[PDB]
Amino acid sequence: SLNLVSEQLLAANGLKHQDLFAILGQLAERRLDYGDLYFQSSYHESWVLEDRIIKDGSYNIDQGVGVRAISGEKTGFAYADQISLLALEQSAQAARTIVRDSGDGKVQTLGAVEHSPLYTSVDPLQSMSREEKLDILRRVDKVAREADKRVQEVTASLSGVYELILVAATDGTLAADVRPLVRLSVSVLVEEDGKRERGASGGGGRFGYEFFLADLDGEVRADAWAKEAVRMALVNLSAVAAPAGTMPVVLGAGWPGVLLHEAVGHGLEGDFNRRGTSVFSGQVGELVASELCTVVDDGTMVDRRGSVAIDDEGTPGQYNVLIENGILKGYMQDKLNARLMGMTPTGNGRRESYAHLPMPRMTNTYMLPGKSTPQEIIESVEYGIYAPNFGGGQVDITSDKFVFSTSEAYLIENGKVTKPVKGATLIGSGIETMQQISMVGNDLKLDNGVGVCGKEGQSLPVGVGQPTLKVDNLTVGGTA
Amino acid sequence: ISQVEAQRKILEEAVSTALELASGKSDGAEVAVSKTTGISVSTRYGEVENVEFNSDGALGITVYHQNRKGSASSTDLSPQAIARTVQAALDIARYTSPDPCAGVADKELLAFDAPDLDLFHPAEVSPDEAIELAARAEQAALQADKRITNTEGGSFNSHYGVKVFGNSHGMLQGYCSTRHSLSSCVIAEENGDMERDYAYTIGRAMSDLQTPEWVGADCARRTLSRLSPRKLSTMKAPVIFANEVATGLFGHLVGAIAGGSVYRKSTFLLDSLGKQILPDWLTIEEHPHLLKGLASTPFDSEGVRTERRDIIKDGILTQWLLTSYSARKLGLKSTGHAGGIHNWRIAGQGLSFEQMLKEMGTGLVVTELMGQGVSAITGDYSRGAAGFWVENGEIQYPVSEITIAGNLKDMWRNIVTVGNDIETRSNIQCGSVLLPEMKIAGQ
Ligand code: NA
Ligand code: NA
Ligand SMILES: [Zn+2]
């Protein structure tokens, strides 16, 4: 990857290795712990089907360089939407003004090392023909409409990104990545006797569009997802008022792992903990979850949306155990916060683009499976909720309050799943909720490739996952 | 002033170049460009933390041929990059399907001679000057009370922008704007419970901002008020949406009356045009041409003129919020809402916040909401809340880890009053709002 990316980002823009030396040298005129240059080019395409036709398409291009100068707690940062020597010089000269004092100028020699490949370098935009891409959307439309007569509207979209990145730093880091990302989304509207509801499905990952035509449990994946959006819509159409108050909640496997993303994930990002602003600050070695819970953030999963072959600081993705048998083991880091905490980078230094600062961020966050069957978990509840699907969530990491909102949910009555109920926001304290996890299923899965995480205005692709699990007490925001 | 006039010339030329390149190969085209420049700084314990120099540029084009559309964008505005962008959009439009509602906005609706709304009030603020404002705000918060034990810092932002829009009916208009803001956010602790809150000031001119010391005082006040909350028991009670969240309560209306939602039948207000959906005394005024307004605009994102309208008049829904495409789907004309709404104003009904507490007597004041939890198609509402419990017309204690639930149709229709404590830093500006009952889920 490095030679191929270097040819596209550096050589093609009149830059050599020695220009990297010169610019890093300009930063190192000042008293800095670290400086870096981050180069990026990306290409985004989208296609949208609605009203049985190919309604829209887009093609979006960006490129640029971002330059950081860091001293202790401090960062100076400037960037440009072009890759050139002048853009690098102007950005370095602005960023380094963070400190006036002279430095010793002693940078480490630039030197790349190998990392495990986690996804193809084949451009997904060019690897499939335009009509074959549009046939995916046409097939989703046909299947969804054929699934039930009550289907009145279908919106199906395909998105693809191809991104090249290169990072060079004063600590000697020299690293590159080639990042594909595709997503298929489906939304359907159903109507019956004047009542309307919506349902959605989709997913993707770091590969080409052929994934959407591959097999999923004996059917074509795009077809299965088309049928899932309809099924979801019809459940919602039948749903009755959700109960209100504190009760047992059984969460399904996969995307309900939003629980972990909100309840512990953000709270374990090293920036909050270095500052002391997270409820988890200073709690390494303490019981922060039930003894049944092992939570990992894993940047190493081949082909997954949330994975990072390198992070945006050039650190290869890692399997990081955050909580082990309920005990807090550590935090997700970037280079800045790791230095200030006396810790090491973990492969969690991520930025939305060259025009944004990296910070500690999640990759794929999930709970390891346990011994219970999903059926045993459901049978243990006399009255509660079963929630196999969610929309999003949110967390206050200081007060340790989080929310997440159901997208498919049911009553459990006498150990059996019964009536579908309307969307409800669930709320709890993160630590207290994790300590209430009394059963952990043997059925781990991750989401289909749909996660978007927002922190400080920067949106990133992430994964979540878990087996089926039981939270003994959780507050359900129903009306009934 | 000269940097921005240099940019404005370049941007106008980029629009004209893109339109000319498109004109021979398309029946219509729309081009939008922008450039935003400025600084963003932060402080930690009164010392500089981050200094970020911002410079963002953008060109987007949409072309139409045989009622087929295609779009492309680039942050590179070189002639060769513009040519590639135009070609990319034209190539897409060869493969999309004909859609008769798609196209350049109607010529008769375009702001060919757009009004000057006085949005541009530049300041030469140096990074060191910016750091001092942020530090002053943060320090004022930190020194307020000994329970303030940590910080998320002070922040100052100052930016100027230029936007130009043109299309194939011959519109080419642009305008400049500025925005400055100052904030701080601190953490307080009591008996092992931490809470965080923030305060801010925002305006188009620096001389419209509150002082740093005001921001810090407000930050500390808000943060300390959060300490030692209770989790309420599950109940039905009246609810006041404090001004800062009441604006968002009316904000849910935007999605519900958007033309895109209406023509797709994906809104719970589909059959409500001309019906009384709010109290008969409540009017929502839209004021797109307010001088210096935070959401004032001389034209929408399709170049369509923006107009003074009463969206709700005496409780009655008077119109949808339409764009060119959704208007055409409904057999109507655009109302100038491409890119959203442009300053909503809802007058108070005479009561202060204190008087609203007394009127309510016993109930919940919500000051912060969390999560999504609002169904566009049904109006069902379920959000996480923090705020205060009120009894005897007096705040008793903060509350958190609760939800509030209902349905927007009922919530809006049965509003009791709206206060004179108007939130003035937002697009939608109103006071606090009293609802007679919601379901509070807790213990
Ligand atoms: Na490896
Ligand atoms: Na033409
Ligand atoms: Zn997140």
Residue numbers in the entry:
A (entry chain A): 2 to 481
B (entry chain B): 8 to 450
According to the publication:
Using a combination of biochemical and crystallographic methods we show that E. coli TldD and TldE interact to form a heterodimeric metalloprotease. TldD/E cleaves the N-terminal leader sequence from the modified MccB17 precursor peptide, to yield mature antibiotic, while it has no effect on the unmodified peptide. Both proteins are essential for the activity; however, only the TldD subunit forms a novel metal-containing active site within the hollow core of the heterodimer. Peptide substrates are bound in a sequence-independent manner through β sheet interactions with TldD and are likely cleaved via a thermolysin-type mechanism.
To explore the substrate binding site of the TldD/E heterodimer, wild-type or mutant (Glu263Ala) TldD/E was co-crystallized with a variety of peptides and peptide mimics, leading to four distinct ligand-bound complexes. Wild-type TldD/E crystals were grown in the presence of the peptide angiotensin II, and customized angiotensin II variant where the central (Tyr-Ile) peptide bond is replaced with a non-cleavable methylene bond, to yield two co-crystal structures with clear density for peptides where the carboxyl group of the C-terminal residue acts as a ligand to the catalytic zinc ion. However, the methylene bond variant gave density for a His-Pro-Phe peptide, i.e., the C-terminal portion of the added compound (hence WT-HPF); it was not clear whether the lack of clear density N-terminal to the His residue was due to a cleavage event, or simply that this region of the peptide was disordered. Using the standard nomenclature for protease active sites, these two ligands spanned subsites S4-S1 and S3-S1, respectively, occupying roughly half of the active site cleft.
